[PDB]
Amino acid sequence: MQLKRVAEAKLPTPWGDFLMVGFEELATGHDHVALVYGDISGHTPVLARVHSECLTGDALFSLRCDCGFQLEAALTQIAEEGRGILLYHRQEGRNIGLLNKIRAYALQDQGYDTVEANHQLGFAADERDFTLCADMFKLLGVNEVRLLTNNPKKVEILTEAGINIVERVPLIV
Amino acid sequence: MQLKRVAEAKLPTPWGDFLMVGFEELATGHDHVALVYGDISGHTPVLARVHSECLTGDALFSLRCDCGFQLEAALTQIAEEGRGILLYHRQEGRNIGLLNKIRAYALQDQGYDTVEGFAADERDFTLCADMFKLLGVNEVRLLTNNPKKVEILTEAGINIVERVPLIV
Numbered sequence: 001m002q003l004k005r006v007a008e009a010k011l012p013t014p015w016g017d018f019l020m021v022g023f024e025e026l027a028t029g030h031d032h033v034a035l036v037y038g039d040i041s042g043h044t045p046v047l048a049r050v051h052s053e054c055l056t057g058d059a060l061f062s063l064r065c066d067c068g069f070q071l072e073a074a075l076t077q078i079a080e081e082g083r084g085i086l087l088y089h090r091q092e093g094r095n096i097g098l099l100n101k102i103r104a105y106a107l108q109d110q111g112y113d114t115v116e117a118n119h120q121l122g123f124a125a126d127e128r129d130f131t132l133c134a135d136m137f138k139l140l141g142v143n144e145v146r147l148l149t150n151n152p153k154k155v156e157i158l159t160e161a162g163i164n165i166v167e168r169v170p171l172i173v
Numbered sequence: 174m175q176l177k178r179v180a181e182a183k184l185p186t187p188w189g190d191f192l193m194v195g196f197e198e199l200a201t202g203h204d205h206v207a208l209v210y211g212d213i214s215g216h217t218p219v220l221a222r223v224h225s226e227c228l229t230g231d232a233l234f235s236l237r238c239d240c241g242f243q244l245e246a247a248l249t250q251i252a253e254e255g256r257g258i259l260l261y262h263r264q265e266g267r268n269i270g271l272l273n274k275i276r277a278y279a280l281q282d283q284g285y286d287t288v289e290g291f292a293a294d295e296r297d298f299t300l301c302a303d304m305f306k307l308l309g310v311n312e313v314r315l316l317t318n319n320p321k322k323v324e325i326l327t328e329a330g331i332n333i334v335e336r337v338p339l340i341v
């Protein structure tokens with residue numbers, strides 16, 4: 001356990017109420033958050049989406065990526081399921097940070113794609129640590145998970161990070 | 174100057190392209206960002222909105238506040254003006270932080286209100302003044318419905334020459 005559950009409140013949205021849970025990294029103090037829809041108790045695998053924070057897409061209407069659409073789509077599918085979870089993993093730009101993501105777009109505003117745009121900035125393809133997400137699930141009393149994703153390689157990674165993914169689920173975007 | 178302009182890229186949106194500029198606090202390393210629409214040069218006062226980051230409202234569709242609507246409304250009015258700036262001031266929950274904002278809602282989910290162990294507003298807007306300076310901006314036409322904000326922001330060093338109602 002690298003996180004601690006520090007608080008929760010009712011988050012009213014156009015899909016209904018979500019229980020929003022605040023998490024704090026024990027070692028850094030960094031925050032992360034989860035949105036719980038419905039009753040997640042029960043031996044029934046829980047439908048969940050692991051979303052990595054993307055300021056530009058998530059809040060600034062960026063068309064340069066589909067993060068915002070994926071975010072809305074996940075909440076919708078979770079609402080339609082009536083029971084689910086969305087982990088808002090606050091590791092901006094694949095854990096390199098917002099500023100680095102901007103200077104990556106700055107380089108992409110020249111040609112080079114995502115991969116070499118980071119090797120140039122000193123980072124690898126993906127610098128993220130999903131064990132934190134596994135910790136959030138644990139703190140939420142969640143075991144078996146039906147993961148919302150269109151990338152099969154993600155399931156390999158998240159289960160690898162310690163998440164008991166018993167089933168996959170495509171995202172409508 | 175407490176900030177440094179570290180990078181910029183084209184930010185395509187449904188209103189067109191914005192030049193997004195990344196800023197870094199010299200003392201903390203914390204980031205902040207600005208979105209520039211059109212050509213902000215010229216002695217003409219610049220229309221701008223100072224938005225304080227609110228994760229729940231800005232990205233998580235929270236109805237518990239109108240931060241998200243204000244955010245969209247500002248970008249729209251700026252787009253309609255054809256020249257403007259939006260400062261995304263990353264001081265969550267009035268500078269107390271996201272976690273504290275959640276445990277505040279937790280109390281509001283109880284009895285207390287938005288004023289009960291921090292003050293009313295812990296924010297420091299001098300950083301915003303710094304972003305404008307780094308953007309080569311002087312005179313500002315501020316987008317806001319709160320007149321008391323103009324007093325505060327000009328106080329923080331922003332040459333606000335006009336308050337402009339933010340239509341939502």
Ligand SMILES: Nc1nc2c(ncn2[C@@H]2O[C@H](COP(=O)(O)CP(=O)(O)OP(=O)(O)O)[C@@H](O)[C@H]2O)c(=O)[nH]1
Binds near residue numbers: 052
């Ligand atoms: N270094 C870069 N990071 C980016 C770029 N565009 C988006 N991102 C970051 O990548 C993260 C999301 O992209 P992923 O491709 O990881 C999407 P997710 O993790 O949600 O995978 P899927 O479920 O398979 O869709 C998110 O944290 C963004 O901030 C880019 O051009 N460069």
Ligand SMILES: Nc1nc2c(ncn2[C@@H]2O[C@H](COP(=O)(O)CP(=O)(O)OP(=O)(O)O)[C@@H](O)[C@H]2O)c(=O)[nH]1
Binds near residue numbers: 225264266287317322
């Ligand atoms: N502690 C609290 N912070 C809040 C609450 N509602 C919003 N906020 C936070 O306050 C910040 C912005 O809200 P304000 O009401 O201060 C809006 P601003 O200061 O930008 O005023 P205007 O220009 O008039 O729009 C933002 O960072 C929010 O996360 C609340 O009930 N309690």
Ligand SMILES: [Mg+2]
Binds near residue numbers: 225227
């Ligand atoms: Mg605001």
Ligand SMILES: [Zn+2]
Binds near residue numbers: 054056067
């Ligand atoms: Zn993105």
Ligand SMILES: [Zn+2]
Binds near residue numbers: 227230238239240
């Ligand atoms: Zn808010």
